[PDB]
Design an enzyme around this catalytic site. Sequence first.
Site, short mmCIF file in Angstrom:
data_model
loop_
_atom_site.label_atom_id
_atom_site.label_comp_id
_atom_site.label_asym_id
_atom_site.label_seq_id
_atom_site.Cartn_x
_atom_site.Cartn_y
_atom_site.Cartn_z
N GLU A 68 -81.13 -4.63 23.14
CA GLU A 68 -79.91 -5.17 22.58
C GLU A 68 -78.79 -5.28 23.62
OE1 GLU A 68 -79.98 -6.36 19.62
OE2 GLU A 68 -81.88 -5.44 19.06
N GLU A 90 -70.61 -7.55 22.52
CA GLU A 90 -71.15 -8.86 22.29
C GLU A 90 -70.45 -9.88 23.18
OE1 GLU A 90 -71.14 -9.81 18.12
OE2 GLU A 90 -71.43 -11.95 18.51
#
Length: 244
Positions: A68, A90
């Site tokens: 991730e 992100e």
Amino acid sequence: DGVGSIVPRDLFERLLLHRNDGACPARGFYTYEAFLAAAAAFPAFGGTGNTETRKREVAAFLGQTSHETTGGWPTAPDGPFSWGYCFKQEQNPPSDYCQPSPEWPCAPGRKYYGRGPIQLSFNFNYGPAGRAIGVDLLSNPDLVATDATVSFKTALWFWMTPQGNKPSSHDVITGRWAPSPADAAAGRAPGYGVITNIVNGGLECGHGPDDRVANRIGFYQRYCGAFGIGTGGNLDCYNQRPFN
């Protein structure tokens, strides 16, 4: 006594070899000390099974969260699976990921985009993660990107907590999880594959070989090698109906 006894500093730094290169925006953030302080709040993590199983849980956990947060690429030095943990938030989020909920309101001006090793996202996951660990992440979500202990904690929270019809990743990897009849039907049998399914199966599982699942598997294998342990079987979710 704790998870430091099965992953010492030199293993951890070599597991996450490149996280601290100059190309990684999260460099210097993910410290061995932060990892242990986080693990100490979830003593079941790395403390459930014999030594082998315990090492496997840390491999599996680190493998999923490495994916991730990877900064890898095919010609990366020491391969793409040494580049786990390069990012802590992100890139280019298209949203504030605020879905107004009576149970978990959004704090005005606060963004709930992906942060930390499991890319925790949405007010409705920051809320429960905050309560579980004693930190108000609904008002202060940036703590998942500014405090490395909180950061790892949210990842562990997700790892250790069962959600709806999905078991915990932790019960799958430690062997506590017993498939239902409807799991056997759907192809879901114990192993790292079911955990990929828990993490992002709706997108990634049930439609044959998939490069995202492959990359998750890749980290896990290397990490299990570093640990001198086998990976177990059913490494993939290519023929698994998603939980979603």
